[PDB]
Structure 1
Amino acid sequence: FPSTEEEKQADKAIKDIENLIGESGFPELIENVCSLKHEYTLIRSDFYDVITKIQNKKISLMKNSHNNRNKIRELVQLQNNLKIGDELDKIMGCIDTAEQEIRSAAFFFDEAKESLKEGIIKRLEKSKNRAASQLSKKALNRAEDALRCLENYSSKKGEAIGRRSFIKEVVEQAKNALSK
């Protein structure tokens, strides 16, 4: 059992992460990220459904181009402003970063759990040129790193929800300008 202080320190950090992520672990957090990729596609879908409607109206108005001279431009100027693809990009970016940090956190978390236990085997063997404490230090500062990655994850996931709610409203607005 964890005895060397350094082990109880590595131990308590592992338990922090376990309680933080809960009974369902990194797989749960991966699924949270999947769900976001789902949100992303649907809002990309809604965005391009709107471009399509603008283009189909333009074509329809091009029957009498000159007469509809201002109305084409409003839809020209609608499409250019509704060129918010750099916000869709930013959401993609945020999501990609998040799924990155949950793979770093999972890999690091395992590295730490595996390292504490090698640490305890090394001490049970009395093979003590600190090799025991070296594993138990690597363990703590793999936990720290897993917690770092869970930190950045939470930031980027939030930015995603946020950016997505902004563009979803800009799309629904553009959409309900056309439906009349």
Structure 2
Amino acid sequence: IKEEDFFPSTEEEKQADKAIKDIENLIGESGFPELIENVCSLKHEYTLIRSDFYDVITKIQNKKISLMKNSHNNRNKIRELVQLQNNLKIGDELDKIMGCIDTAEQEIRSAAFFFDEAKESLKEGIIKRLEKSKNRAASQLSKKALNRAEDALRCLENYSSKKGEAIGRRSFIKEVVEQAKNALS
């Protein structure tokens, strides 16, 4: 027995290890913990624009209604505030943002759990090979290791698509809200 009989030597060991390594490459040194926080700060940043969004909605509707006492005499001023309210019909993308976030937060929890399952199953595979008479059981554990590594990568891939989209939409609606605030006063 020597050191390198303990390293991915079979071909399914090599594949599982390849799949495990580019998980390691995707997360890199800050690992799953950085990827969990990045969602939580997504959520927080959203919550802040959510509340700016409802603040400005209330204020525009109130200024509108005050002016509408004398609707005839201030119709064009009313039409401008109606124009800000049309611009602020963005309820559908706050909902879309909260959907991406719910999905990101679920997929990174699954990705972490799947990552660990892969490492464990590869380790059990290797042990089963080194135990000399169980290479079929070695093979099964090393294939499960790859199938867990692959579940992890797909979970990470959706995490990234959904976090990216939540960011693009967060920035769209922060702009609309900022534009309505600057417009209004």
Q: TM-score, normalised by structure 1?
A: 0.89
Of 127-136 and 110-119, the range deviating more from structure 2: 127-136
Measured after TM superposition, the shift of residue 88 of structure 1 is 0.9
Counterpart CA distance in 2 for 1:20 and 1:74 is 48
Q: Find the aligned partners of 1:16 and 1:69 in 2 and give their Cα distance.
A: 62
- 1:109-145: per-residue Cα shift (whole Å, max 9, x none)? 1111110011122222234160111000110121122
Question: Aligned to 1:24, what secondary structure does the other structure show?
Answer: helix
Shift of 1:75: 2.4
Q: How many residues align?
A: 179
Q: Is the 8 A contact 2:97 2:169 kept in 1?
A: yes
The equivalences for 1:103-142 within 5 A come to 103-128=109-134, 130-142=136-148
| Distance across 1 between alignment mates of 2:131 and 2:142 | 15
Could you list the runs of 5+ residues in structure 1 that have no partner in the other structure?
none
Offset at residue 165 of structure 1 (A): 1.4
Percent identity, aligned pairs only, is 100
Per-residue deviation, 1:81: 3.6
| Paired residues of 2:87 and 2:176 also in contact (CA < 8 A) | no
Q: Which 4+ residue blocks in structure 1 deviate beyond 4 angstroms?
A: none
Range with bigger deviation, 117-126 or 58-67: 58-67
Is contact 2:19–2:150 with CA below 8 Å preserved after alignment? yes
Q: Can you list the C-alpha shifts for 1:29-77, whole angstroms capped at 9, x where unaligned?
A: 0101111101111111111121121133134335545433443344245
Give 1:157's aligned residue: 163
Q: TM-score, normalised by structure 2?
A: 0.87
Structure 1 CA distance for aligned equivalents of residues 181 and 95 of structure 2: 20
1:40 aligned to 2:46?
A: yes
* CA–CA separation in structure 2 for the residues paired with 1:90 and 1:167: 11
Query: Aligned partners of 2:69 and 2:133: how far apart in 1?
Result: 88
Once the two structures are superposed, residues 136-155 of structure 1 have per-residue CA deviations (whole angstroms, 9 ceiling, x without a partner) of 01101211221112112211
Unaligned runs of 5+ in 2: 1-6
Is the deviation greater in 60-69 or in 106-115? 60-69
| Contact 2:101–2:163, Cα closer than 8 Å, also in 1 | yes
- Report which stretch shifted further, 152-161 or 109-118: 152-161
**Post-superposition offset of 1:89:** 0.9
RMSD of aligned Cα (Å): 1.9
SS, match of residue 25 in structure 1: helix
